[PDB]
């Protein structure tokens, strides 16, 4: 999401999260959901318009920012972004750091993008929440992305967690749920400061995994728990390969050396396992000669 702050007291020492939509920025304007007061001699009463576009689907995958546009409102002393004069018709920016000078004000408004892309585990969940989050500047999606910061698991309806959840946990993504989304549905009209929505996501995550037999204590104890072992699967996606890598496994992807060198087959007279079955073991027992001894029992038998 986009945030602005400034040096000096030109924004009253406060930062602000800017959602998609339009703001009028100026000396004689009151801080509400669509106006930003910036007090300095050389800033016009109504000085600039900032327009933030809503995110595209691509940004969920690239981690790119919402397009940020600046128009100068025919002012006395002009507007610059990153030292470039804003012309008539304005300019648009897709960089993640903008230094915006209004007039001759010696202090710049500093706009920066904080990464936040939300993956959903369920298509009906995505369709219900996507428009809501997009209006906050938060890209969303279903498929795997390297720009994902948060992952929404389905209601753990007294049942097993999905591979998407297991994967998110392991790559150290913050796992959230419905209750945090309900919180986000609260905030569009609000004027709130930098990092306002992030810690609640971490609190949600920490509470989710507490007393939960689908999770161990941390990603750290799961990571490399199967080192020394090796496996094989059919047309492994790079995500499932990375998932198995994170468990410390040696992987051989296929389309006498597939059989006796490889300890088991992961799926979707050889010995086969699902990732779902592998997760059950990856939690269960204690040590490296215990939590990897039940997996070593399933191989010999």
């Amino acid at each position: 999401m986009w945030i602005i702050e400034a040096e000096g007291d030109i924004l009253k020492g406060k930062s602000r999260i800017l959602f998609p939509g339009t703001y009028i920025v100026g000396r004689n304007v009151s801080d509400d959901s669509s106006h930003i007061q910036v007090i300095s001699k050389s800033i016009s009463k109504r000085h600039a318009r900032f327009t933030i576009l809503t995110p595209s689907e691509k940004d969920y995958f690239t981690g790119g920012p919402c397009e940020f546009e600046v128009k100068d409102l025919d002012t006395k002393f002009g507007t610059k972004v990153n030292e470039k004069v804003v012309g008539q018709n304005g300019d648009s920016y897709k960089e993640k750091d903008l230094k915006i000078q209004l007039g001759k004000c010696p202090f710049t408004i500093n706009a920066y993008w904080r990464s936040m892309c939300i993956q959903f585990d369920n298509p009906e969940m995505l369709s219900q929440w996507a428009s809501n989050l997009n209006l906050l500047g938060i890209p969303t999606g279903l498929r795997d992305s390297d720009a994902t910061t948060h992952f929404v698991m389905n209601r753990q309806a007294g049942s097993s967690i999905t591979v998407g959840t297991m994967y998110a946990f392991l790559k150290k993504t913050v796992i959230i749920d419905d209750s945090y989304l309900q919180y986000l549905s609260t905030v569009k009209e609000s004027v709130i400061e930098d990092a306002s929505l992030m810690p609640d996501a971490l609190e949600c995550f920490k509470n989710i995994i507490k007393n939960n037999d689908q999770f161990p204590s941390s990603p750290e104890d799961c990571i490399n728990s199967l080192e020394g072992f090796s496996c094989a699967m059919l047309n492994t996606s790079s995500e499932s390969h990375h998932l198995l890598e994170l468990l410390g496994l040696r992987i051989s992807t296929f389309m006498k050396e597939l059989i006796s060198k490889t300890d088991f087959v992961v799926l979707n007279g050889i010995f086969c396992l699902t990732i779902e079955q592998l997760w059950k073991i990856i939690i269960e027992r204690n040590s490296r000669e215990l939590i990897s001894k039940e997996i070593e029992r399933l191989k010999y038998a």
Binding site: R27, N28, K41, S42, K45, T75, F77, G103
Partner: peptide, 5 residues
């Protein structure tokens, strides 16, 4: 208030 330096 009129804008200046």
């Amino acid at each position: 208030s009129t804008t200046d330096e």
